[PDB]
Structure formats: structure tokens, C-alpha cells
RNA sequence: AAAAUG
RNA sequence: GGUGAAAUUCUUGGAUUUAUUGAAGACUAACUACUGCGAAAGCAUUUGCCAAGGACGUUUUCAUUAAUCAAGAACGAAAGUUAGGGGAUCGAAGAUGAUCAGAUACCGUCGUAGUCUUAACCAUAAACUAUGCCGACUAGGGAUCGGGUGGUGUUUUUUUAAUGACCCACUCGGCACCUUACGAGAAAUCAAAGUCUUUGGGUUCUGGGGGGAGUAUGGUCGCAAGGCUGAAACUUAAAGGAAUUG
């Protein structure tokens, strides 16, 4: 049975700290506790260690990332523009 | 055989600038305006004020050594009117007959590629 | 501990002695273990590589940027932060860069930086939600928490102390020429109140 | 109580080594002083003069030419090509309703070092026997024409220096080459290289400048 | 009055009614 | 009732048309609805063509023209008489004068 | 495309899935072509390339990862490398390069 | 430019 | 500078104006149309990539798989909300100058939120063609967009031809238009709003005099603003539509 209507992971906090803060925390807690796809072994086995560290349980490869996501949108944009600048410089 | 400047008539509404410069435009010669020639605060853009300003500008240009002018006439442009004010043609005629020779008349009104949303609100000036 | 950004232990070979030298870089986002990091003038424009500022094109995103060449990294070191290469002046060789604070700085073109953005971004988007979490955050940084308000003190303890109501009493904007013991509040404030409009004037 | 024209001197603008006419006119500047050099006040001035005046022919009444002063050589300002632009009246006259306007622009480097942006324009036209009153292109014709013009401009630059590019622009041969390469797509009446914009200059090369 | 401003006045009055009903319990 | 058979605009098969600003008062009006007039006026008519020709350094100069597409809102066009109120039958006439 | 040929081979021909069976087929010389996923570890890819060089076996580099290669060969599990033993009635062995 | 009420 | 006229404002610390540059964000002029695409809202610089779509052509394929749809879903202008970024312009609020009898309005000068973007909410517009969708048939005509077919066709070169553009004829699909309406309608007008007292092709939704009132209450959705659903008491002989003459 669905145990909570909307709080989900933030049901641990009970009625404290305010609903808006609880939702803000819930989004990032789900993000940080989700399993992610490994770009090296292709499995959905990447989990966070401390903030910014994302380790695959399989293949034991760990990558630097966001505090609560494996890849921030800013880092993805940075990677894309670095690829663009590198390709332009080489050609 | 002539010494060429640039006329640079900025004929807005509410004013007319007759601003003769060198060929580069960095050095200016006898910038005169309609508000310099009238003292009524509403005839600053008038053809008579523009004619007086152009006559003074051409007199000082002939005293400096400028004999001919390439003409560049503009409206306010940007997003405001795009139509030359009532004084531009009068200033150009006064420059034409003040002894100055005329060359390469062009309209240099700044025209956007649909930039810089126009002032006034979506319902415009309601008079 | 005490750092939002994770660190990367990058092992290099000593060019002058047979041994390994471990270096502690600030991990850039995308850097992984087993990755080859290239550091030098001829290193390629790849994330995690250490390049001189002059060798990267306009718009490049770098991190751990040297203020002076050889200082081994001063700018854009906190998690999620980066420096933007916004121009070069090859004569009197210098690089114009945008710092995380929005300042524009001219740096020597020989100063090095790490390609990419510092890992651990988005950290401050999560509410701490708890005095306990703030406690554990500052337990590994310094004894700066919790903070008693100076207005809650006695006059002996703070310029804001005292009064039959808790109130500042005089303007909290304090001159830059004030002395120690006076610089409490908004030191050398150019303005006060809620920021409305656009910052970074010309 | 100054009359700043007593402290001013006149210089002659010698634009080309190639246009038709060395003399374009005069410009005045303050006399060189202790802490203010007239040669420094000059050497950055741009003069926009008509290609009709540069060539002696009124068939170049449009296509204003920008000339940037590079050196002051004994009361003579030697300039060089700085850009070309059509006149506003010519552009507005060319742009008409009931036809397709095709614009292309490329950023190309000349053979030696000059970075320029070339803006070419063209307009669709009716055939001699056409009954239809608008003669619009199908935007695939537009894409193909734009690609052809881009290739033409990028290969006409990158094979010549700035001087030879100016000498190619003056007779408008690029317009004819665009017409020849696009006539099998759409008739394309009013082909023009409407603008050349200088983006980045090489190292000075006073020797290269000294061709006039 | 104008229909739009009548609707706006009704919305303001509805907000007032909601506020007083909330203050009561 | 419906005054104009199609509408007081020209929009069928579109739904939305981007607006333009009136040259006179800057009111927002959809481009298909705005009254558009082209001005091809000579750079110098000014009762002055001969004066400028005499002052000109070039023989047969052929002074240029200013081209301006004016967009008027309905109220401004009617007030400035670019367009006039027509009879019920005359409204159904799209031929220019 | 490569996917239709691969599906035809799976449907009609003979194949082995996985690194160990691929290497065994290479060393017995009954592999006609090996398809290596884009995300295969570089050391394993190099070893497969060396085996295929020794056995004169063609190597095709699948643009997708192991998930994509498994999907292409029609399996619900990741496949890092495929080995074609017999093409069946499929032109994969000749419609390459 | 200003012009409300019956 | 601005206006009808002014003043607020800036200005010999050089304003406005001129030239050369740089930065920023927004926008995408002219071309631009009784033109195109999209379910609608909407969509207008180039190029690349990604999937998608209508129409046409088809002596391909399946064979009734379809039409419309309570409940249920997806999208849904602008404004507004939340949190970052950005914040050039314009600009609810606000401040000011004027006008005025008053003018916290129109007009002038600034200017916050907003305008832009990302991640989410909101779910409303005169969201309009105030015209549900599918199907059939009933006038005359010329244009135009996309595809196709044909020609003793015109022009372009590549060497035979050919596509490309154009012309002529036809055709399918589309945005529309003009004339007349046998027909319809209260009329305005309508090729559908026709094929309706000679009333039945299929189907969904909505209305039942004007107010009270989209109000109260309850429910539900929403962070909120609000959205959806939604009375009754009471009151009233008119309100309303189109057209005619003044
Ligand atoms: K004035
Ligand atoms: K405190
Ligand atoms: K105190
Ligand atoms: K703003
Ligand atoms: Mg009016
Ligand atoms: Mg009034
Ligand atoms: Mg605190
Ligand atoms: Mg105390
Ligand atoms: Mg004290
Ligand atoms: Mg004090
Ligand atoms: Mg006390
Ligand atoms: Mg009416
Ligand atoms: Mg609409
Ligand atoms: Mg009465
Ligand atoms: Mg004034
Ligand atoms: Mg079109
Ligand atoms: Mg455009
Ligand atoms: Mg429903
Ligand atoms: Mg919106
Ligand atoms: Mg303003
Ligand atoms: Mg509604
Ligand atoms: Mg409706
Ligand atoms: Mg009723
Ligand atoms: Mg009526
Ligand atoms: Zn892994
Ligand atoms: Zn208007």
C-alpha cells in the first residue's frame, strides 16, 4: 500500500521544519539516494558516497559529480562547450 | 578641387541638428541646432530654425575651409519615429544654397532588426 | 572533511627520480578514478586537464585557477564554482577571466587552471533543516557556530548590546576607517535594504 | 577665446594602392604638441567614402567603402580597406514585396591573416513569360542557394589577400559567379555582396601597407 | 459596473470572506 | 452583429499573428490587422530638387529615396485619415485608390 | 541498418553472446565477425582486437553500449560483444566497411 | 490644450 | 530632452550631437502575403543533430481493425506563484512633472515585480470562425499553397537528354476568396448557418425569461492567487437579438 500521500522520504521529519522546506529537501533526497546508470559498465549501480562522489557497486569505478546528482546541468553544459571548443581548436 | 566634410543632419521631432564634421567624423565643424536659433521651446524642430542653424553651420564651415559636404540625414530611428523631422529638408536646402557644394546624400537613420521593444505600452499613447 | 567539493588523488611520475608523487587536486565534475589527467602547456582541452590560461580559447570553463603562475591554485575552488575565460591579450600576455563572484580579473597567461567545473555543485540548494546539521557542518570547519546576536548582548560585550529593547541604536553601517571593536554590523556598506533590480554596475 | 581651428592642421587621405584614385579628401587634426601627438590622434580614423568616388564611375554609387588610416607619412594618411557596405537607399530599393529575399553570411579568413564576415544578398525573380505574380522560392531552393553562396564566398576568400578580395569586389565578379552557380536553382535577379565586415586584423606589416 | 471590475470586486470580497472565516473557528 | 465578413483583420488558418507597434502612438496591433503604408519619398523633394542639383558636385546625381513601411493601428489610421470610414457596401472593396 | 542485419543473424544464423564465448570462438576460428559495444572496457576491446587480428576476424564497433547491443540482438540482458558463427540468410558479413 | 451635470 | 504647451531631468565636472571601440540581455525588422506548418495554445536569423507529421504517388500490405465519445489522461497565450540564473529594453506597484475643480487618470520623466531562461506549479482568455466531430450530396468562377500526370510548350547547359524556374491542361489535398443564392434564416448574413412541419446518416457537449449569481454552502484541485462543481431565499415584465426611420 502507498503509505504516504505526498511526503514520501520526508515522512521521517514528521510535522517539523515546514512543508516547503520538507518538499525542497525531499526532491534532493530522492535525487541523492537514487541509483544511476554507470557510463563504464552500463549497469544501474551508481550510488552516492559523500557529496560529489558517485561510486558504482559493480566495476568499482567512482566519478566526481554533483552534491545530489551524478551530473549537474551546469557540468553537462560545460562538457558540451568544452567538446565544442576542443573540436574548433583542433579544426 | 574641393574640401569635403559631412553634413550629419539629425532631424528629429522637437529638434534639428546640423553637425558638420570632417570626412572621418572624429573632428567636428560648427554643430548648430534649431534650439540655438529659436527661443520658444516648441519651434526647435521648425523648418525656419533648421534653416537658420544650417546657415550658421555653413558660414562657419566656409570660414574654416570646408567647401563641399557629403550629406548624411537621419531621423531618431531606433524604435521611436523612423521618419525625418520637419527641419531636415529645410536644413539641407539652407546648406545647399549657403554656398556649400553637396555630395552623396544618404539616409542613415538607425533601423533595428526588430530589437528593443518600443516605448508606450501595448495600448500606446492615449490622447 | 570541512570541504563540500571532493578531492582527487592524482599520481604522477617524478621526472627526475624514480618514484611516484601523489597530488591532491580538487575533483572536477566528470573526473573519475582510472582516468588519465594531463597537466602542462601541451595538454589537451579535456575536463580534468591542467592547462595554462593562454592555451584555452575564449569561453572555456576552468577551475582551481592560479592567481599568479605557480601558486598552485587560488580561484574557483569551492564546490560547483568555476572561472570563465572571457578573453586574451597576447601582447603583454594576459587572460581576462570572470570569477565566481562576477568580478573580472586579468591574470598572467601562464597561470594554470583545471578544465571543467568543481564537483559537488548544488550543495547549498538543500536546506540544512536542523541546528544539528549546522552543528555537524561547522564541527569540521571551525568554532563559528552558533552565533549569538550582538543585539542580544550587554553593552560591555558588543556595540549592539544593551537597551530596554533589543535594538541597534545607531546606524549599523560601519565606516571602513573604524577600528577593531567597532566593526560590527555592515562594514563599509555602499547600500542597504533588499536588493531590487540588476547588480554589477559599470 | 580659443578658436581651435588655429591649432589644427590638414592631412590628405591616400586610401588605396588599388582602388582607382589615391586622393579621397582631407581631414584636420590638432597640431602635434608635447603630450599629444597628431600622428597618434590619427592612425585610427575610419573614413567612409563612396565606391563611385573611388572608381570615378556612378555605377558604384552604392557600396560605400570604409578606409582605416594605418600610417601618417609626411602629411599623408595612408589608409587600407576596413569594410564595405551597401547604401540604405539601395538596400531598401532592392527589398520588394512579392519575391523571396535570400541572405547568406560567412566568416572567412583571407589567404594571409584577415578575418572578415561577408554578407551576400539575392532576390528571386519572375521569368520573362511568368504569369504568376510573386515568384516565391520553396525554401529548399533557398537552403541550396544559401549553401552555394556560402561555398562561393568561402572559396573566393581564403584564396586571395585583402587587396585581391577588394580588387575582386570592385568589378562584382562574385555576383556573376553566384548567378552562374544558382541559375539552375532559381532565377535570382539581384545578387550582390552587400557587406564585408572586418573582424580581426593581422600584425601591422607596414611593409604590406607600403604598396601605395 | 463593468463586468471585469465586478468580477474583481467579487473576488476581493470573497478573499475577505475567506479571511474572516479563517480567523473564526 | 458581425461588421466585417472575414474580420477586421486578415487571419484565416493562423490562430496567432505576431504584433507590431503603431508608428504614431505605439499601440500593439497584430501585423495582419495593422494598416501598412509604404513611403518612397525622395531624399529631397522639399521644393528643392533644382537647388540641390545646382549645389551638387556630380552631374546627373539622381538623388536617392527614403523607404519606410508605416504600421498604423485602427484608431491612429482613422484619425490621421490614412483610412476612412466607408459605407456598408463600400467596405467590401479591397482595391486601393 | 546494422540492427536489421543483426536481428536477421539472430533469427536465422548462429551466434555467441559474451566475452568468454566470443574469445573461445575466435581461438577456434569459427567466428566470422565480432561486434563490440561502444562502452566495452578498452583493455577488453584491445584484447578482442588482438584475437581478431590473429584469427583474421572482422571487427564491427557497435555505436551503442552493452544495453543497446543486447537490445539489438534481441535479449533482455547486456551484451558486451557478439560473435557471428554463421550468418544464416543475412548479408551482415558482406555489407560492412 | 480644456468641455462635468440635467 | 519632452510635449498640443510645459515642467520634472541632464548640462562649460562638456549634456545632446559626432567618430572609434567594448559589454550585456532581449528581439528576429524590411522580405511578410486574404501565404505555410501545428490538436490547440502557437510557430519567422544561419547551420548541425534528433525524433515526428500532413498531402501526394502507389496494380505494396492488413482486412473492419472504425466514428463520436461520460469517467479518465496529455498539452494548454498572457498574467501570476516557488527556487536558481539573468536582468539591455519596456514596465502592474511606487515616486514625480503637468493638466484639472479634484486627477494617488489619460500625457511627461524615472522606476520595483514582471518582461528572458532553467526546474517545477498554475489551467485560465472575446483560448473566436463567439459556428463540436465523422460521413454523403446540392451552384457558377478565378486565383493561390503542397504533391502528381501530360504537352510538337518557353528559358537555363552537361555532349544526346534531363531535372531547376516558368507557361498551358488536368488532378488530389489545403488556407481562402468572388458572384448568385434554387435553398436557409428574425435579419445581419450563410456553400453552409443548404439538402428541416416534404420534420430521422452517426454521435458528444450545452441552454430553457431577466436578476440574485457563477453568489452562499459543501466537496475536490492548487503553495497561493484561484480552477472545477454549484444552489436557495428573494425580486422582476420585461431583459435581449437583428434590422428601420429619425
Ligand atoms: K522641442
Ligand atoms: K543568533
Ligand atoms: K543596544
Ligand atoms: K529588470
Ligand atoms: Mg483619440
Ligand atoms: Mg484629454
Ligand atoms: Mg545565522
Ligand atoms: Mg541580557
Ligand atoms: Mg560599547
Ligand atoms: Mg557605535
Ligand atoms: Mg531587556
Ligand atoms: Mg456595433
Ligand atoms: Mg488566439
Ligand atoms: Mg434626464
Ligand atoms: Mg529641447
Ligand atoms: Mg512560406
Ligand atoms: Mg529576418
Ligand atoms: Mg472529461
Ligand atoms: Mg505563460
Ligand atoms: Mg522608461
Ligand atoms: Mg472559459
Ligand atoms: Mg466559447
Ligand atoms: Mg434562465
Ligand atoms: Mg440593437
Ligand atoms: Zn560500473
Ligand atoms: Zn496608433
Tab-separated table of N, CA and C in Angstrom, chain D residues 22 25 65 74 76 88 123 132 149 157 203:
chain	number	residue	atom	x	y	z
D	22	UNK	N	44.116	57.784	-55.539
D	22	UNK	CA	44.763	57.898	-54.237
D	22	UNK	C	44.070	58.931	-53.354
D	25	UNK	N	40.250	63.000	-50.124
D	25	UNK	CA	39.875	64.217	-49.438
D	25	UNK	C	40.881	64.537	-48.351
D	65	UNK	N	32.576	52.392	-49.009
D	65	UNK	CA	33.815	51.719	-48.641
D	65	UNK	C	34.407	52.418	-47.427
D	74	UNK	N	54.285	61.892	-43.698
D	74	UNK	CA	54.549	63.227	-44.199
D	74	UNK	C	53.325	63.954	-44.716
D	76	UNK	N	50.453	62.805	-45.108
D	76	UNK	CA	49.673	61.906	-45.950
D	76	UNK	C	49.252	60.711	-45.113
D	88	UNK	N	21.800	52.506	-47.694
D	88	UNK	CA	20.474	52.176	-47.187
D	88	UNK	C	19.418	52.325	-48.273
D	123	UNK	N	17.672	38.075	-54.580
D	123	UNK	CA	16.220	38.111	-54.615
D	123	UNK	C	15.723	37.243	-55.758
D	132	UNK	N	2.413	34.088	-62.976
D	132	UNK	CA	2.312	34.192	-61.526
D	132	UNK	C	2.964	35.483	-61.044
D	149	UNK	N	26.049	29.903	-52.182
D	149	UNK	CA	26.641	31.215	-51.940
D	149	UNK	C	27.686	31.136	-50.834
D	157	UNK	N	37.133	34.159	-50.796
D	157	UNK	CA	38.060	34.427	-49.703
D	157	UNK	C	38.815	33.121	-49.487
D	203	UNK	N	48.953	41.188	-37.670
D	203	UNK	CA	50.037	42.063	-37.248
D	203	UNK	C	50.303	43.094	-38.340
